[PDB]
Amino acid sequence: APAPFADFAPPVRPQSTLRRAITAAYRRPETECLPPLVEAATQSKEIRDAAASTARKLIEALRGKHSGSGVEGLVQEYSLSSQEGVALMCLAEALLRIPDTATRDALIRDKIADGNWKSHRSLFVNAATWGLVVTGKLTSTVNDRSLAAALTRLISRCGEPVIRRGVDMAMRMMGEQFVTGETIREALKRSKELEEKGFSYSYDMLGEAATTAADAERYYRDYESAIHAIGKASAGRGIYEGPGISIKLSALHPRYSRAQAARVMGELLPRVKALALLAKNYDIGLNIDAEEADRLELSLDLLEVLCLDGDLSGWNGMGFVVQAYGKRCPFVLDFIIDLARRSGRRIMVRLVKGAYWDAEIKRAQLDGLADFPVFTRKIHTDVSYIACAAKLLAATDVVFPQFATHNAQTLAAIYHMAGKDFHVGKYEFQCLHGMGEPLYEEVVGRGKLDRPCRIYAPVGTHETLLAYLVRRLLENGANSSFVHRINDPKVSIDELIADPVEVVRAMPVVGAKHDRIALPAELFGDARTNSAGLDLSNEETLASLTEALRESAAMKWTALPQLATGPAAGETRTVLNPGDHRDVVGSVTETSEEDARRAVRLAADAAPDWAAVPPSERAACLDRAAELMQARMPTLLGLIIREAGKSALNAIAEVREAIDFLRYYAEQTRRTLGPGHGPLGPIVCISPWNFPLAIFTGQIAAALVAGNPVLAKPAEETPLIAAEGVRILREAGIPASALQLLPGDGRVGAALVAAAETAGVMFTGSTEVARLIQAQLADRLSPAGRPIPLIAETGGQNAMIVDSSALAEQVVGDVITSAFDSAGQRCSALRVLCLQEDVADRILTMLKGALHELHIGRTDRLSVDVGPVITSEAKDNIEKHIERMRGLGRKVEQIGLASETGVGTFVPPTIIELEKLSDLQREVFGPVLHVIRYRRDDLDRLVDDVNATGYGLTFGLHTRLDETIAHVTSRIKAGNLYINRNIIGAVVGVQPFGGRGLSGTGPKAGGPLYLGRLVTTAPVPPQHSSVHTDPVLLDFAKWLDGKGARAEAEAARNAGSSSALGLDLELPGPVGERNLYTLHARGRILLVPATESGLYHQLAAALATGNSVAIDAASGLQASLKNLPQTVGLRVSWSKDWAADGPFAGALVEGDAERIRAVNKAIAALPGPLLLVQAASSGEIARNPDAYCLNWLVEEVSASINTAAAGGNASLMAIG
Ligand SMILES: Cc1cc2nc3c(=O)[nH]c(=O)nc-3n(C[C@H](O)[C@H](O)[C@H](O)COP(=O)(O)OP(=O)(O)OC[C@H]3O[C@@H](n4cnc5c(N)ncnc54)[C@H](O)[C@@H]3O)c2cc1C
Ligand SMILES: NC(=O)c1ccc[n+]([C@@H]2O[C@H](COP(=O)([O-])OP(=O)(O)OC[C@H]3O[C@@H](n4cnc5c(N)ncnc54)[C@H](O)[C@@H]3O)[C@@H](O)[C@H]2O)c1
Ligand SMILES: O=C(O)C1SCCS1
Ligand SMILES: [Mg+2]
């Protein structure tokens, strides 16, 4: 048996002094990066004056030949609105997908111009891109109804001539402007004109981010065939005067990442070597493009091996991009220059600013990392660029600098920095096709500056173009971009030639972070501190984590019954690693049923003393526990990895979630709890195995901070991390009498629930076990004669709907994560993928290819993607489902498992293609994705089928179309919605988490209504109000007044005002996402009245919160509701057989204690979902206007929208 963590994440090679200096700068504070860059970029007064004069001359030329674009001229000629221009270009795009030119012209003449364009996949799938072209602004989703109206209007107004102009315009841009050519031969033919003027070329076969092995093979043969064509055309011109190629490493392997470094060096490197050998034989340049920040240092390992490989000697064409917007850039250049000296290869170094800025900001915020790997002020990147250019110009004997820029100020500064001596091969400039030719026609040639420029030339069909094209249009439209400002009349030439080096030097704090971009720690501002993660791409982090993880594995972890009086004796057994039962993780002593009953009595005796600790001090304990967990995160990771079968990434997220619960409930307490919000009493917290620290901590922390002593009963599978969490909470100041730990199985849970002094239960787990607890509690009443509160958060049958406008690569990534992360052992995991029929085959092929790149095994290796299932019984239950489906004829795709999995309990990720959604009965808690197909016109029926399971936890939708978003999100019934992203997000206070139906009672964990359920009188949560009044409530109040029920009419009006139905908030979070929180009606509420006035109060509460009702017909109160307004009657039904008329979404009960007990038992016997029941006596209804609390009669819905899904971030376009 291998030692734990002995092979966790060894580096590709020992890290040299130069490599370690790169890693040290990864997230260096911006105020530390800039001073040395300012010093390096400083030039003399004479040079700065000459550079400004050169830059002014270049800018005056650019503005003096500036002409209006063809799109702007078309919009002007036909007086088009912006939406009309966008819709016209979408139509033109679709028309050009008809190959036969004469067939297209006939369709235009006889069908399109004749009105009905709809008759002949949305036309507007790519409207976000055309929106950038027409308006310069990026919209994340498409208003397809606005575009359809605009297209009808413009065709009916202008007819065939405008369509003809649109087609011809789109044909030029897509064939000549967006790309240099559709094929490499076409691009080579079009390059002759500018090569005669002194330009050179580097061709990019458009392609990146391979999803499957087949994709990577395709990109490889594209590169290989382009090298042949370029080399044949080069015909011996060499690497400086002749053309070259650019490649992206992510195109050549589907798992290009630090986590898969061994596969990268074993599988990707030989492919790059084979391409480089061919480039060497033709003597052309081969450049490795730079991608995301977490790929930089990995790419250096490939560069090093290739430059030391003797088979490539004699050739100086290997090239490499370095991004000046990155904090590591000068240290990367130090490494490359030294490698060039060691190898004797004159490495071609392309200095760029960088293409992924928006995405790097979002990623660092999501991951809770210390800082960004890029600058946050645009002028900092400019200073970085000039400083790095000085370093390169001092090293032209050993490297070939290539200065890629469209900024005339940058260009002029480098041109003068380089001085008077020049020869071809010393250095060059570079620009992008369709962006830089105007500027460099003022540079190339003996009549200008006599400096060469290489054009980066994209090659590809309309299809393969999207990702690259959006990045260019974002660059072109960003407020901070030179190419945008040059065309801004409000921007003077003096502003354009301002020297960024001197502007930065003169700022009061050199290198200060952008004022409007929050560090990841500060996402929530003054409310609370964000939890911090760990960068698993940082070699220093991986080295220290390896040591900490190994040390965690040497510890003698235990879990004991920790009563208020001290540890208790009991039956003891080992806890085994689910991925390898030979790995003993620790020992657990389980609680006897007698000691569990004893613990509740000790909790009851201690309850007054803990309630007396003021809320601010209880919240301070939670904050101290969060600090302790943050500091102990590496050790906690090691325990979670080995006890619960989690990967390192998933364990980090788990510990972050626990920290966030602690800080969120602390802050909510400080905002709400006062002397009149008395605790319930001892609360039993029963938790699941699959989030063994986060959900465990969240329930206990909420109960404790609300003033309740807690009996903590963790899942029998994962007691060790629970015991450590209790240890941390007690260290933080929670008294032993206020938090007792009771390990064991469901018997211990049931004994606690049944104990007489148990005042409340918090349950997270399976729906079937929640139903047993509901039945136990139906026997019971509080000393005040009211039901024992139960929060029961249960399973899901979670769907994702994908239409023909979604991007397959995005979909497949979010499906692989949502369905198979943690081996599908997330309550939020994707269970049913619904694919529109027209794209289903392509997406399924891509999904299956991505499935086969996953690594399944014991999770103490960074390279492992999917770990084990928790037990042999879980495995048996999952496989029985797979075999039942397999026996019914359903197609089943499974990864093959390595033999080393035999010592643990593993289930391979599985795809099952279903015929109907009713083929599924219950939640299958494992790595099993079901796939169904649907026709577009059946979308509404499909949402019905998803709702018809009775679950309502997480739900995903992938679409670009606003009409479809509005339709689906208005009809789906689930607690957590996700648009154009994965569905496993539960960020505390950002996506408050929890569902409806068979998925939960609410209120949501990590949301503002949670603490109020754990006290006898609920406070008013922050931001909890609504100015909207339910109109049926208003009609009912008028009816009450007409009947003479004046006091009840006033109570009804008061309920209408007090209701928070219609609350609609946006919660603070990371950039590039919109996180929304709304209060809706729950549904149909069962009313069990005893008196006429009680019925009127119950009806008012239910209607004020937007619900319909079913009224118990055995009440005999039918005569009390005569002559209702039709609007109210529509919401009212009478029920003789409650079980026939469900499912209900809650219940209101009136009666004395024994009537409430009898009704509670009858309600618990109803089939289906657990009901949140509220009960009151007739006297309580008369005395207390809040006898029925309106908090529990609305339904919380969280929605998370990825607003960067279209390829960039519109808001950050105006941030520089
Ligand atoms: C031929 C060529 C090849 C290229 N290859 C690559 C490549 O392989 N990998 C890659 O990542 N990029 C690459 N780029 C760069 C990228 O695609 C953009 O073209 C370039 O960053 C624009 O810089 P500029 O000097 O033209 O314009 P400018 O307007 O001077 O600079 C714009 C740049 O500033 C940066 N920026 C904007 N806002 C901020 C901010 N708030 N804080 C900090 N920085 C900010 C961004 O990098 C942005 O692109 C290449 C560029 C060219 C011309
Ligand atoms: N809605 C959410 O937020 C959420 C979150 C995570 C997991 N879950 C659900 O939890 C399930 C997986 O977790 P699990 O396997 O640990 O659930 P489980 O129902 O098997 O057990 C959960 C806890 O209940 C206890 N238990 C079992 N029988 C009991 C009984 N008769 N009386 C009292 N307690 C009893 C168990 O010991 C355990 O501590 C999944 O269905 C998952 O969907 C829901
Ligand atoms: O494709 C991109 O976004 C960059 S890589 C080389 C050109 S700019
Ligand atoms: Mg169980």
PDB file of C-alpha atoms and ligand atoms in Angstrom, residues 289-290 321 323 325 350 352-357 375-378 381-382 404-407 430-432 456 472 475 480-482 1215-1216, ligand 1:
ATOM      1  CA  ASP A 289       1.110  31.367 -27.697  1.00  0.00           C
ATOM      2  CA  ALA A 290       0.496  32.288 -24.029  1.00  0.00           C
ATOM      3  CA  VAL A 321       4.963  34.598 -25.819  1.00  0.00           C
ATOM      4  CA  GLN A 323       2.429  38.577 -21.186  1.00  0.00           C
ATOM      5  CA  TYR A 325       0.076  42.283 -17.943  1.00  0.00           C
ATOM      6  CA  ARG A 350       6.918  37.753 -28.402  1.00  0.00           C
ATOM      7  CA  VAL A 352       2.433  41.081 -25.557  1.00  0.00           C
ATOM      8  CA  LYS A 353       0.275  42.758 -22.975  1.00  0.00           C
ATOM      9  CA  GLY A 354      -2.294  39.968 -22.611  1.00  0.00           C
ATOM     10  CA  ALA A 355      -5.620  38.642 -23.798  1.00  0.00           C
ATOM     11  CA  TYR A 356      -7.385  37.105 -20.765  1.00  0.00           C
ATOM     12  CA  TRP A 357      -7.603  40.024 -18.328  1.00  0.00           C
ATOM     13  CA  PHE A 375      -2.142  44.068 -12.917  1.00  0.00           C
ATOM     14  CA  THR A 376      -5.444  45.820 -12.239  1.00  0.00           C
ATOM     15  CA  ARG A 377      -4.617  49.259 -13.700  1.00  0.00           C
ATOM     16  CA  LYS A 378      -4.052  49.400 -17.446  1.00  0.00           C
ATOM     17  CA  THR A 381       0.624  46.928 -17.838  1.00  0.00           C
ATOM     18  CA  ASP A 382       2.013  49.690 -20.055  1.00  0.00           C
ATOM     19  CA  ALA A 404       3.459  42.980 -30.441  1.00  0.00           C
ATOM     20  CA  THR A 405       1.434  46.152 -29.956  1.00  0.00           C
ATOM     21  CA  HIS A 406      -1.098  48.448 -31.634  1.00  0.00           C
ATOM     22  CA  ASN A 407      -0.322  51.328 -29.246  1.00  0.00           C
ATOM     23  CA  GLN A 430       4.074  42.572 -34.581  1.00  0.00           C
ATOM     24  CA  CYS A 431       0.386  43.313 -35.063  1.00  0.00           C
ATOM     25  CA  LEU A 432      -2.918  41.479 -35.478  1.00  0.00           C
ATOM     26  CA  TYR A 456      -0.600  37.538 -36.795  1.00  0.00           C
ATOM     27  CA  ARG A 472     -10.589  40.988 -30.416  1.00  0.00           C
ATOM     28  CA  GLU A 475     -10.141  44.582 -27.034  1.00  0.00           C
ATOM     29  CA  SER A 480      -8.922  51.610 -21.959  1.00  0.00           C
ATOM     30  CA  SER A 481      -7.755  50.270 -25.352  1.00  0.00           C
ATOM     31  CA  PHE A 482      -5.602  52.429 -27.619  1.00  0.00           C
ATOM     32  CA  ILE A1215     -12.512  49.528 -15.888  1.00  0.00           C
ATOM     33  CA  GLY A1216      -8.910  50.493 -16.635  1.00  0.00           C
TER      34      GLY A1216
HETATM   35  C1  LIG B   1       0.649  39.879 -32.848  1.00  0.00           C
HETATM   36  C2  LIG B   1       0.079  39.715 -31.461  1.00  0.00           C
HETATM   37  C3  LIG B   1       0.133  38.473 -30.831  1.00  0.00           C
HETATM   38  C4  LIG B   1      -0.402  38.333 -29.537  1.00  0.00           C
HETATM   39  N1  LIG B   1      -0.354  37.100 -28.883  1.00  0.00           N
HETATM   40  C5  LIG B   1      -0.890  36.966 -27.598  1.00  0.00           C
HETATM   41  C6  LIG B   1      -0.838  35.700 -26.815  1.00  0.00           C
HETATM   42  O1  LIG B   1      -0.239  34.585 -27.318  1.00  0.00           O
HETATM   43  N2  LIG B   1      -1.343  35.631 -25.542  1.00  0.00           N
HETATM   44  C7  LIG B   1      -1.944  36.738 -24.969  1.00  0.00           C
HETATM   45  O2  LIG B   1      -2.419  36.627 -23.744  1.00  0.00           O
HETATM   46  N3  LIG B   1      -2.018  37.981 -25.664  1.00  0.00           N
HETATM   47  C8  LIG B   1      -1.492  38.100 -26.935  1.00  0.00           C
HETATM   48  N4  LIG B   1      -1.535  39.331 -27.598  1.00  0.00           N
HETATM   49  C9  LIG B   1      -2.089  40.524 -26.912  1.00  0.00           C
HETATM   50  C10 LIG B   1      -3.584  40.716 -26.864  1.00  0.00           C
HETATM   51  O3  LIG B   1      -4.198  39.865 -27.749  1.00  0.00           O
HETATM   52  C11 LIG B   1      -3.864  42.198 -27.194  1.00  0.00           C
HETATM   53  O4  LIG B   1      -3.678  42.415 -28.538  1.00  0.00           O
HETATM   54  C12 LIG B   1      -2.982  43.212 -26.472  1.00  0.00           C
HETATM   55  O5  LIG B   1      -2.965  42.927 -25.127  1.00  0.00           O
HETATM   56  C13 LIG B   1      -3.417  44.657 -26.749  1.00  0.00           C
HETATM   57  O6  LIG B   1      -2.363  45.508 -26.338  1.00  0.00           O
HETATM   58  P1  LIG B   1      -1.878  46.869 -27.070  1.00  0.00           P
HETATM   59  O7  LIG B   1      -0.384  47.306 -26.802  1.00  0.00           O
HETATM   60  O8  LIG B   1      -2.316  46.621 -28.545  1.00  0.00           O
HETATM   61  O9  LIG B   1      -3.052  47.914 -26.654  1.00  0.00           O
HETATM   62  P2  LIG B   1      -3.369  48.701 -25.416  1.00  0.00           P
HETATM   63  O10 LIG B   1      -4.702  49.481 -25.581  1.00  0.00           O
HETATM   64  O11 LIG B   1      -2.143  49.456 -25.243  1.00  0.00           O
HETATM   65  O12 LIG B   1      -3.306  47.756 -24.255  1.00  0.00           O
HETATM   66  C14 LIG B   1      -4.473  46.977 -23.942  1.00  0.00           C
HETATM   67  C15 LIG B   1      -4.175  45.893 -22.905  1.00  0.00           C
HETATM   68  O13 LIG B   1      -4.065  46.399 -21.615  1.00  0.00           O
HETATM   69  C16 LIG B   1      -4.341  45.357 -20.726  1.00  0.00           C
HETATM   70  N5  LIG B   1      -5.290  45.887 -19.781  1.00  0.00           N
HETATM   71  C17 LIG B   1      -6.524  46.440 -20.063  1.00  0.00           C
HETATM   72  N6  LIG B   1      -7.102  46.845 -18.924  1.00  0.00           N
HETATM   73  C18 LIG B   1      -6.262  46.574 -17.856  1.00  0.00           C
HETATM   74  C19 LIG B   1      -6.332  46.776 -16.488  1.00  0.00           C
HETATM   75  N7  LIG B   1      -7.491  47.399 -15.897  1.00  0.00           N
HETATM   76  N8  LIG B   1      -5.315  46.387 -15.710  1.00  0.00           N
HETATM   77  C20 LIG B   1      -4.198  45.808 -16.227  1.00  0.00           C
HETATM   78  N9  LIG B   1      -4.098  45.602 -17.561  1.00  0.00           N
HETATM   79  C21 LIG B   1      -5.091  45.970 -18.387  1.00  0.00           C
HETATM   80  C22 LIG B   1      -4.808  44.172 -21.514  1.00  0.00           C
HETATM   81  O14 LIG B   1      -3.741  43.297 -21.668  1.00  0.00           O
HETATM   82  C23 LIG B   1      -5.204  44.810 -22.794  1.00  0.00           C
HETATM   83  O15 LIG B   1      -5.190  43.910 -23.855  1.00  0.00           O
HETATM   84  C24 LIG B   1      -0.983  39.448 -28.907  1.00  0.00           C
HETATM   85  C25 LIG B   1      -1.032  40.686 -29.545  1.00  0.00           C
HETATM   86  C26 LIG B   1      -0.492  40.817 -30.832  1.00  0.00           C
HETATM   87  C27 LIG B   1      -0.552  42.149 -31.519  1.00  0.00           C
END
